[PDB]
Amino acid sequence: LGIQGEVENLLTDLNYFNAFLKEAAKSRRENEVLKELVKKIRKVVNDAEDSIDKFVVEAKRHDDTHVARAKGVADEIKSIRERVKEIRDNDAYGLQAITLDEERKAPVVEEDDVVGFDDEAKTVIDRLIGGSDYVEVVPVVGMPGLGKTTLAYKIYKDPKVEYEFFTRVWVYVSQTFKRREIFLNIISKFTRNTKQYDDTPEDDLANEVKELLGKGGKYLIVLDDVWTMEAWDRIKIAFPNNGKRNRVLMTTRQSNVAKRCNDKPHDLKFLTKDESWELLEKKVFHKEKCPPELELPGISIAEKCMGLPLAIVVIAGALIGKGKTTREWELVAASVGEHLINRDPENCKKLVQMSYDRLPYDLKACFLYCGAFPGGSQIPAKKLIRLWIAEGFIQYQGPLALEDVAEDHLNDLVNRNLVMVTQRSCSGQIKTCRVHDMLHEFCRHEAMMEENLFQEIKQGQERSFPGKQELATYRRLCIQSLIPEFLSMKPSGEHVRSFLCVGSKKIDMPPNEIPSIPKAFPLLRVLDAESIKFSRFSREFFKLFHLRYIALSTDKIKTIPADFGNLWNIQTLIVETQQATLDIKADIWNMTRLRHVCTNASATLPSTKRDNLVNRCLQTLSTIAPECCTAEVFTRTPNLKKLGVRGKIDALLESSKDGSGSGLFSNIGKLGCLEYLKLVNDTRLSSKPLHLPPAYIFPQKLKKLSLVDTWFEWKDMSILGLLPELEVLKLKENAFKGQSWEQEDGGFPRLQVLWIERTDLTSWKASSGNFPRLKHLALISCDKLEELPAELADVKNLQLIELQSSSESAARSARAILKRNQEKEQDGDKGTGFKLSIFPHDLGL
Amino acid sequence: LGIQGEVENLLTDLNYFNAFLKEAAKSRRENEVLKELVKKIRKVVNDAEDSIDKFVVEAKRHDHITHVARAKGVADEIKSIRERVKEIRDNDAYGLQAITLDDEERKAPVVEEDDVVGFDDEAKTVIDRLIGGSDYVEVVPVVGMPGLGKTTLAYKIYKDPKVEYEFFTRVWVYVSQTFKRREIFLNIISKFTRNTKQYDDTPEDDLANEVKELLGKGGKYLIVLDDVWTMEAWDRIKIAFPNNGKRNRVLMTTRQSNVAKRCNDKPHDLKFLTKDESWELLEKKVFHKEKCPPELELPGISIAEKCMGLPLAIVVIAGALIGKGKTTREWELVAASVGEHLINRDPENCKKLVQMSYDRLPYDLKACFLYCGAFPGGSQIPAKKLIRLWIAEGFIQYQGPLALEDVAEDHLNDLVNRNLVMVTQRSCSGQIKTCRVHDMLHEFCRHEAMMEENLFQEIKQGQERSFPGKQELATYRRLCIQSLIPEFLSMKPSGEHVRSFLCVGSKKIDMPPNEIPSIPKAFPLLRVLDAESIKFSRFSREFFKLFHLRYIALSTDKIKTIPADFGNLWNIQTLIVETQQATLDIKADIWNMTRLRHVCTNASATLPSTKNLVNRCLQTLSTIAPECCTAEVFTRTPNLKKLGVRGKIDALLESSKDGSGSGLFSNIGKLGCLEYLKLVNDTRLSSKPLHLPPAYIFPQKLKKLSLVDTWFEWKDMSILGLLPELEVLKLKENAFKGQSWEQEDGGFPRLQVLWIERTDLTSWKASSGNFPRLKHLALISCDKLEELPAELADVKNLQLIELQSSSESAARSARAILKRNQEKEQDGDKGTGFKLSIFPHDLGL
Ligand SMILES: Nc1ncnc2c1ncn2[C@@H]1O[C@H](COP(=O)(O)OP(=O)(O)OP(=O)(O)O)[C@@H](O)[C@H]1O
Ligand SMILES: Nc1ncnc2c1ncn2[C@@H]1O[C@H](COP(=O)(O)OP(=O)(O)OP(=O)(O)O)[C@@H](O)[C@H]1O
């Protein structure tokens, strides 16, 4: 095809243009002509990929009117080629400024009136005074503008620290530094003739600092703003390990650098609601107090700063200028975020840009994507990761899976402290993450204005929904509320690649506005509408040939139709169905890029037997029917890592007709990559109690098991103990039935978490070696339990136990177990941080 | 079809050129060739956005032979613009090279030490403030407009015998627009020790610590931070200033009030020279020791008044008078052209100082500040009229949550805080009401906006500058005419590129009937018509063809109804019809105005039928008929913040006796954004006076109320006390009827200003619970009041009560309150700064 030829020439220009965008993004350009040049080529690049993906889809449909649509694509390619040719000619003067080719400003912090750091300084000073006799690093970690340097300078000037450490050196490390000037700066603290070392190498300069520091007692060295582990390695030569309890206090935005200097870094606190108000009040009114007319909007101002001292200091600058009237302060309270970033591009914007610009080029889009969700809202890590892959941000072709590559992208953001973690799974994996309010405003301002990554759709007080001229340039739409009325305007976005319904309350699509999304946005790759209840599938949903992510709630539909299989590019499938049976009639076995099938009903998979391929990318098959756990299905998914079965566990374990007792559970053991297995039972009216198949038929690589309502006997825990890799066991809704549970010796070699909900169990007995690696034990709503085994005190890995609706004798046994554990720790064993939690606290007085 | 595509091609070029102008305006280089390139590109850009706007209104009107001809004309005009764009790139390639690429001044200014006139009192005021104060480091920022004499006063303060005697060490520091903090610290160190060579490897952190040590060797220090421009610049320098509790002082000079407020919440705004002192300086600078000859004394005082007490203007004209010789005729010629000598012919001294504040202004604030020069010199600019003009011209670009009025008001606050715009009047709440630009800045605005950027051009008939011809009108962008409007309009002017027509005159003129349609005929692309100084006897069909109109203000004595064809101007934001008629009936389809923001009139406006769509941008409806305050009208306007009612308001407060509670006043309570409400009565022949509806019917977010001739009994004032957020209440004559005024306990929880005029009040009883926040209480022409309640003296927040020609008992009560308050202050009670003013001094003294 000649269209392929002009596409290939277009791709060559795209490689140059993308190289220009990457090169221009490596350093922030202050020239407006280059700013508009970057935006112009960034746009023509975006329309270029959208045009080629149209040709790719149309060529795929051609290989597997049609001619008129292909002709229209060719016309788009010709128009794009005319655009790139004029860019290379008219704007060539701007390209030459990027095809071919610094001030050290140490920060200034508060000396007097430091608010809320009285106990953080006390904690860190205690860690500086005590410890080993070797040079120990005490890192203070935090997000941009948290107050690390303010705390470090508070410690540096503390009366106890000054007396403790005879020699105190403050060194300003930064993103860029020269080791020679660092050593000469430290040398200048001690001797005035620094011209003495003009030709002395850095090797002997470091030994010179060794001599200066070792002449007295301890030394404390505050390495401010360390950004890399290489910087600490290169500078630490000057610091001798002469066994004098020497300390190196360090401040950094990087948790990975902090961990390598000390395995327990000191994460700095956020100011409380009263400390934020106290700080803002002091900054604005100085010694005087806030008049009562301004206290009400002022308190809201300090609470909207989310306890970040940088935001409170920046906002107080605007309040000082505006005045002391009530009306002005409510205007600020309604636009706290804008005052931080847009109105102040020199305090908050430049401080955040110090971390954003140091990001890798691929991680920048991942970080800005977190701003699509509402400010202060919890972002599920699994949801965020699946959106990154579906958007194309995760480009990777190594041995690992894309989930594990996007996960350490997120863990890199958390290490950089650009993303905060609110909940962690039992295995330590990130579960729920949230971006700070000012960083979120930076994500909004950068993505919507500077990069056109995504756009908010709203009609607030005065602003309205975007017009036809704006939607023609929009690439991603994120919307929280008023979705049905937004779609009632009949919008038309030709360049829209994603539609994120980030609203928290589930809405219902009217039957007339159900097909609005597929027609408004024909190039939709991502449709995150799990907060929307669709009652019907419309045929236009099956014309989204570019679709890769689709999440949707439903209350009525039961079957995914066969026309849904026309979307060969789909990766993630989330259908939160209120019903009980979800017959997936779509040909999901021909989606070579399919990765996840998540649902809550009993999904019935289509027939695998009859392209001659295998679903090598499919990783999750959650809550499918037990009838579909066939041998052919598990052959089609060699790389499955999570499996879920719901309903009729009776048919999962029943023996076959060939005489062998191994049932459908035997095929599950053939999944060599399986880590998570979930079994949920529904048929309480069945006359046959369920019996667990022997452990040699289980998947031997299973690391997490969840059972609900299965009515297994407690004697089957003995064969759950034979699993070599099981680490998390959660049992809910009397999944185990019986009044007595007596453990056999041994078993559970590496189980770490045991979660128990309501069951008719009354007695529990065990031996010393039953839980060699148990760390967390939880028991909820089991009012029939009499007592807990005393052998739990021998669990060396025990850290926390939670009991609800438990007997007082169980609390007494917990007290004895804790007391024995404390006695063991007093023999030299390190403390495990034992904790006990009984909810509600009003129970038992 | 392809014409719209060609508009996209032109728009792409316009984005590049607009960025070119934005980047070029960031650096005023000496390259003259680039100065002519930016002027040529700017003219093409202006002629391009005009052609694009012509295309926009043509497309809107179309969606027929005349339309086809106009479309062909637009296509030809666009083609000419495109061809002009190609000439820019073909010939001025080098000019674009200089801006897409990138790349002595720290000499302290000279100020006279001797012959300083008019600063004896101001210096003593600041000295008495430096000597006193607290025990920690206090800053005393002197702040004023460019050329005011801050450095002259600061050097005078720096050299008095009292300042020199009291302070241990005094240091002069010249901070500037751009400075290096390292050099400042090395200069302070250079004064204590001359061996500054030894700090080459010493970082700025240890330099600031060295300045701490040097200043801390003794007692007080006074440091004159000259010309500080930023909040950050003060923070980075104050780290070198020790705080040892010895009453250390810092004397800062700055053009920024917001920077001054941060250092001290009570900035010392420098005063302007009086008319006597201005003449004294001029005669001392021109004639030196010799006195002015008597023949030159009369013109000399005339030019001294032209400077408006600014020393910089006096110094500049002094050089002009020296060069121009000493003759009476020449001096009178200078007095007629003072502005020319300030800026046009002396760019060496005056213009550069003005440009220091101007080039630091953000790009959006530059056009906002230059627009303030359109109004006549010394004239008073209303703040609400100025703000609406900025929005109409497009200078305010905003997408956040605030309203465009609040953003533009913040722009006005930024200009005032930069001392580029004076504030002459302030509202009760402290909002800026009337502003005026200083004379030197007005001439700079006119020079920059006529001879450099072509923002606006004035029309006048002087000695040599007659009315401009057709060639000059072909380049005029905005028209500003003060007088001789009918004479200018009689010649049938033809300005096809005029975007504004500001009648900046003060006295109203009646437009001759035969010249009424001349304004719309002359400038078809009129975007702003500020004809509020012109009385129109009739509307014309030519007015309804100004499809680009956004701001329209006009006075009238004959027009009673706005015609329906007025609604053809869908772009209108502000609609002002100041009519002397009793009623105004708006037949125009104002609901179709999607961007309508303000409708203001003095008559009882009768709104048209609303018959889904919502006017989200409408903020003000001003005075309307009571019968039009329906729940349907308020549905279409949810963001209304000011409402006015005029006429027979008994149709508003009447009870719906049919059985429902749907009184027209109850619909007002459904407006959640209302903040100010006005009611004016016209009909007095009701059998009984009206009574207020219950307070829960009032809008809860109401913060200001105003009633006229409503004849409300004083008993129904306590219900106004149940308004939670009310802050200002004002009443004109006969708004309240009766002689006895009594209040319940509590009420008025947030009242701050109360206004009463010419009521029948004679007896007044109140309680301390009704005034928790009251600050202003005026009783103009309420001479029948006997005595003020004693509870008023207990109100801490009370500020001023002003009465003239009051009763003898009222004067005696004022004397008793003043005497008792003075006695209490002498006994240790904290003073509230309460003042009483009596004019003239013949009575009451
Ligand atoms: N407890 C506090 N009281 C008053 N001001 C504070 C406090 N903590 C921080 N600040 C102010 O907040 C701003 C940012 O704090 P700080 O300089 O310590 O940032 P940081 O966490 O070191 O920043 P970076 O991310 O650049 O390393 C500074 O202007 C500082 O004065
Ligand atoms: N009271 C005065 N008597 C005589 N000359 C004065 C007086 N005040 C100021 N001047 C003169 O006015 C001119 C400008 O004043 P000055 O240099 O003090 O300006 P400024 O307020 O510091 O301005 P900028 O905002 O540019 O810093 C100088 O030449 C100075 O000598």
Side-chain angles (χ1 to χ4, degrees), chain A residues 61-77:
Chain A
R61 297 171 89 254
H62 172 76
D63 182 65
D64 296 349
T65 64
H66 182 286
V67 171
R69 279 185 168 88
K71 176 183 179 181
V73 171
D75 272 358
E76 295 171 1
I77 299 293

Side-chain angles (χ1 to χ4, degrees), chain A residues 109-110 114-115 117 144-150 253 279 309-310 313:
Chain A
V109 298
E110 317 269 338
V114 186
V115 167
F117 282 163
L146 188 55
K148 303 179 285 293
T149 308
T150 309
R253 299 180 182 185
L279 173 56
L310 173 69
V313 160

